[PDB]
Amino acid sequence: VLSEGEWQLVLHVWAKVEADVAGHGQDILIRLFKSHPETLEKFDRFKHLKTEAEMKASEDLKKHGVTVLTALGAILKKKGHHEAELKPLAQSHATKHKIPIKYLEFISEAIIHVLHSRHPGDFGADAQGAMNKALELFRKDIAAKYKELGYQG
Ligand code: HEM
């Protein structure tokens, strides 16, 4: 359970992200795909991209990055009371997209790295730990829906 102070740290940085949702989403998916290439293989949409320059030039990858971050933003702003917003994300990610929990750990590391790069003054260690805790709570609650559905592993 995050504390109110920890939520304030999370959403203080998140408000900085919302000024350039698309640039953040490009940098986080690129980082994800370069750091963990198995992840790129899950997107039929993107698996033609073979260099980071091709990734950076894809408008469709930029579009999906905004989809991802808008969904995550709507979850963080519920401060833990996010059951309505995860149901559908867990259902589609487990049963249609086939994404293992560990790849949600990987995109969480990429989100944390990009935020540190772009917002160091609002993303010191207190805010890094709170955001870690927020992303762990996301993964915990998604893992429980996976497990219901027979996909936790
Ligand atoms: C913060 C974590 C994430 C969030 C908030 C998120 C959000 C979304 C949303 C809102 C969609 C479109 C609606 C839907 O299908 O449910 C989506 C689609 C999809 N996601 Fe995620 N996602 C996350 C992580 C991942 C990860 C780590 C992967 C792959 C490794 C992945 C793979 C996909 C795929 C394959 C689709 C369909 C893309 C297409 O072909 O249009 N997602 N995601």
UniProtKB/Swiss-Prot annotation:
This is Myoglobin. Residues 1-147 form the Globin domain. Monomeric heme protein which primary function is to store oxygen and facilitate its diffusion within muscle tissues. Reversibly binds oxygen through a pentacoordinated heme iron and enables its timely and efficient release as needed during periods of heightened demand. Depending on the oxidative conditions of tissues and cells, and in addition to its ability to bind oxygen, it also has a nitrite reductase activity whereby it regulates the production of bioactive nitric oxide. The keyword Coiled coil does not apply. One of its GO terms (biological process) is removal of superoxide radicals. The keyword Ribosomal protein does not apply. Disulfide bonds: none annotated. InterPro entries: Globin (IPR000971), Globin-like_sf (IPR009050), Myoglobin (IPR002335). Its EC number is 1.7.-.-, 1.11.1.-. Belongs to the globin family. Nitrite binds at H64. O2 binds at H64. The modification Phosphothreonine is found at T67. Gene3D superfamilies: 6.10.140.2100, 6.10.140.2110. Heme b binds at H93. The modification Phosphoserine is found at S3. Monomeric. It comes from the Eukaryota. It catalyses: Fe(III)-heme b-[protein] + nitric oxide + H2O = Fe(II)-heme b-[protein] + nitrite + 2 H(+); H2O2 + AH2 = A + 2 H2O. It comes from Physeter macrocephalus (Sperm whale).
